[PDB]
Structures are given as structure tokens and as C-alpha cells.
Amino acid sequence: LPEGHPLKTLYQENKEIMKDAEMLNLYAKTLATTKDERMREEILGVLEEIVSSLRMVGFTHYNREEMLIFPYIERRGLTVIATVLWTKHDEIRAMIKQLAELLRKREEMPWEEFVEKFKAKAGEVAFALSDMVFRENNIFYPTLKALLSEGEWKAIKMQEDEIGYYKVKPPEWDPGEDVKPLHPWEINPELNVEQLLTLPKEVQQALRGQPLEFDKTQLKREEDIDLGTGYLNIEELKAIFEALPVDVTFIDKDDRVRFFSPGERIFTRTPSVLGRPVQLCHPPKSVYVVNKILKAFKEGRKKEATFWLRLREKYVYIKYVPLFNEKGEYIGTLEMTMDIAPYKKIEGEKRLLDW
Template identity: 55%
Template structure:
């Protein structure tokens, strides 16, 4: 029977190598493959790798089989999510997790394969390079999938009083981000086989564990709690962050108006609470939603990305670590920030043609920049000069409306002396108590 398993697996891999897709193979071999226990698959794969019957190109293809046949026991909650139309943000998260699970499997298999080969085996270098390439690509999980959850999903459940869950998940996300960075550095340093294999298998386990937590706990919670309007808002915002290895379609549609966290009713009805997964109810207890805070106050100004009072707006401009000046489309100075400035400005400059605010010797440069911006050549202009022992960075940006029409020019001036001296990283606060 053992040889039959190996031969069966070799037959499937051969067809994969020849370009046959997984769905077709499921129909041909699904019943037979499902009879092979999951723990036996790596043993068979190792035998085939050592015998030279498969190469690095087949590794990822084998992981499609892992996900489809041996890790593909979809929970009831998963089946409900799979019924959602393509393009629904929850379905998108779920589909990304399939890719993440596949990549976790590929990481485990690549690491096991690479370090099972003798160092003088000519295939080892090829496997090692593929492992480095694979780990390098995993950082995209944190940039896309995890970031969308942290920035777009977590605010809605936090507002409902579920704060422990996002805190734990975000911590786990960061552990995975750090582990990816660590493993990549160790690979580039060519650490010992034992250490590299250990770290790779641990990262694979962490990625798979996060998929399990999300698919079986987080996503069923979101399906119960979130309204169509909340999903609509998330859908509108998620493209700016991006997706992990999937193409997102627009099959899902809703007539609901988008609802942001500060606009929603955070209370959870007893009926809805009872539908939550037991793991969530154990952590959250009886929910205490955030109902006291009102984002929009009397006399607030609505800005595109928030609400501010005039007092706050002025204070923000005075606090900026650089100074700005705005020249309108007619070439007149309309605004400058207060607080510490590198180049002096006084209220007498307001309404003044910008050409009169510069030395006559540099007016031709000012005119050249304004003309280029008005004509739609949008590249910022920048200069840097020495002022004593300080390095000053000066930049000019075209300011455009939503349709791309020219509104004016923004001058940004910054002392970058200290910035140029920075080296390495500083991740801890060093304030003295």
C-alpha cells in the first residue's frame, strides 16, 4: 500500500507539472487522495524530493493539493462565508486566507526540502534561493491582509465594546511580521540549517494558526455584527491598502449608504449577542459599547478626513515640524503657518503677489515653477541650502482639486539637519520619568 500511495502521489504531481489544474485533479483523484492521512504527505514528498523525481517548481503546486485535499475541511462558518458574492470584503478576507495557508504550507515544505538535501547536492542552491524568495514575499501579508483588518475592521468591533480580541490579534500580527523579518535576515546570513529550519517551521505554524483564528472566530463574528453600510464603507476604503495575491471583483453590490465607526449604533442586541461565537462571548463578556463619545461637535469644520475646531486647526499648523505657505491660483499669498518658521512671514504678506516675496534674482525660478504647475506638469520642485550649520529642504507642490484642476502652490520648508544624522532604528521611548 505504501508504494501505491507514492505512485498515486507521483501520478498527481506529474499531471500538475504538465499543467493540469487542481479542480480537474480533484475530480480524478479526490477520493483516493483523501484516504492518505495528512501526516503521511510530507513523508511521501520527502521521498520524491530525495529521489530527484520532483524539483523546486513543483513545491508550490503541491501546496495547492495540501490546501484542497488535506487542509480543506471547511467549517460551517466557512461555508457560510463562501456563499457571499465575490467582492464582498468578508469573502475577500477569506479568499486571502486560502492563499496565506497555501504559502504557509509552501514555507514548511520548502524549508524541509532545502535542509534535507546534502550541502553538496546541486539542487540545494536552487531550493535555498526559492526559499529566500518565498519568505521575502510573505511581508505582503502584513502590508495588505493584516493592515486592512487593523485599520478597517477592528474600529467597528472596538466601538461595540469588543476590545480584547483586536488587541490580541494585532499583537499576533506583529509577532508574525517580526518573525518574517527575522527569518529573512537569518537566511541572508546563511545561519545554521537547524536554526533556519526551526524558524521557518515556526513561522509556518504561526501563519496557519492565524488563519484558523480568523476563519473560525473573527470572521463569523464579523458576519453576525456588521451591517451592509459598514461593509460598504470598508469596501470603499480597502483598495487603498491593497490585497494579498487575489484579484477582487465587484460582483457584490449594496444600495446601503456607507457607515463609518463614529456613525454607527454600537449597541448589540441580546439576540445578536447570542449568535456570536462562544470564544468571543468568553472574552468580551457582556458588551459595554462606546456610546459616550461624539465625534462631531458644535462649530466643528468638516474636513475631508475628519472634523476640527478652528482652535485645533490653528494649533496644528503652529505645531507642524515644518512651515508651509500657500499661494492661490492667482499667484497671491493666501496663508502661512504660524509657530516657529525658518523663513519669516508676517500678516503684511497676505494678498501679496508671490513674486514680490522673493529676491528679484530668483523671480524667474518662481514663475517657471508656477507656470509648470498651472500647465499640469505636477512634479514637485525641490531645493536644499545651507544656513550656517543647518541643512534646509525647500519643496513646492501643486495643489489640485478632485478633478485635477490647479488651486495653487504649497511651499514646504524643513530643517533636516537632525534627520540627516539619523542611523539605524529607534523603536523604544527613552523619556526620563
């Protein structure tokens, strides 16, 4: 594997996780046998760095695997691998968090109680991290290596920086300017019998006696609009805009009303307003404000205008922003209106349901 290959990077990260898991163990055991106060504060300082570093495993390494890689094997009938790895990743994340809390609350308890709990907990984290590196290196990665095409690895390589890396700064990798990058919906997910039989034993065992089922669902449908980050049809777009907590009105480059969101709105709009200069939409007394906002937007002196007021039981929050396209060119202005009184009365936390 060349430097930069997403698979090489995963191996490289694992080598760093192994070192950190092992230094964690070394330092936790050592802390438990150390009497000198100063030497204790030194070991604790290293332990804080190691543990704080290990928290990054979930946000980078595990996260890239779960978000970038699993989709390609799920389509190939290997969802169980993904589900089982994901569940383990979470158990390790939870254990690293417990370890950080212990280290943080160490002066709330006698020293003998702290060092013994820290040593036990560190031993468990190190063992789980190590066992995951081994499962990954020896079972999961040889699977990916046999199954994924260059074009899938290229698609993957492209999204990696959005998430990040555990202690690796990988260089560039492109397998070829004529290799087309493949998203999970673009591959042939099918595996033949020989591929099935060459799967590691542990992966075949995970199937629990059930032949592979491939996912050939098509993302792009007949009437779909390619929005860059998804595919939607007219009916979906309509229902989405209605469902939003903002009422929206789009003013295009001629300063003409071009679109308003459907459904119940705070300030009603009619069809007869489409194509109308925004200045003819307002009382003549409001026009100076409308024009001074649009000019500041166009010339780039301002990037927002905000108003708000009470309107019966509604706390109406109004915001105007200029819209720009990819090249950085002004394409119009968006008016956004919402009732913010419902949020004003949100307190504490809700992380569960009620049904």
C-alpha cells in the same frame, strides 16, 4: 457570500496561506532528508519563494484586518478580540522574519545545523499560521458575519486596494447603489443580549466576565471643518500650522497673498500683507523672478522652485510649488520655508525614548 465580498476574500486568502504553510512544512522536512546537492538547491529555491511570499501575509491579509476590520468590532465592545489577534499576528510576523534570516544566513553554519533549525522553525511557522487560519475561519469570521452590516462591508471593500491582498484578485462588489457605506463612527455599535449569547464561546470567554461596553463617540463635532481625511476646527488648524517645521505662505489665483502660517517664522509676515499682490510684497528688483516662477507654474513648465542659504545659525531651505485642485486646475502657489540645519546633524537611529 458573493465573489468580491470582503469576507469571501478573507476566506480565500486563508486558503492560500494554508497551502503555503503546508508547502513550507513539506519542503523543510524534505530538505532535511535530501543528500543530493542539486536536489537541495532546488528545494532551497522553492523555500525562498515560499518564505518570501509568507512575508506578505502581514502586509496584506493581517494588515487589512487590523486597519479596516478591527475598528468595527472595537466599537461593539470586542476590543479584546482585536488586541489578541493583533498580538498573534505580530508573533507570526516575527517568526516568518526569523525563518527568512535563517534561510539567508544558511552558509554561515554547518549544513546539519542549518537544516535542523530550518525544519524546527518552519514547523512552528506552519503550525502558527494554520492555527491562525483556523481561529479566523471558525471564530472571528462567523462573528463578523453576524455583526457587520452590508454598509460596513461596502465601506471596507472601498479601502481594500490601498493595502492589497494575499494571492487573491477579488472582483467588484457593491451590495446596492442605495446601500450607504458606513464608517466605524457611523454604525450602531450596540449588541443585544441574544447577539451576546450567540457570540462564539471563545469570544464570550475573552470578555473575562465583563459585559460589552459600546463606543458611541462622535467624530464630527459642531464646528468641524470636513477636510476629506478628518474633521478639524479653527483652533486646531491654527495650532497645527504653527507646530509644523515649515513656514508657509499661500498665494491665491489673483497672485495675492491669502494665508501665512502663524507663530515664530524665519521671514516675518504681517496682517497688512493679506490681499496684497505678491509682486508688491517684494522689492521691485525681485519681481522678474517672482513672475517668471508663477508663469512657469501656471503654464506647467515647472512644478517647483528651490532656493537655500545660510542665515546665521539657520540653514534656510525655501521651496515654491504650484497647487492644483481635484479637477487639475491651478489654485495658487505655496511658499515653504524651513531651517534644515537641525536635520543635517541627524545620524544613526533612534527607535526609543529616554524618560
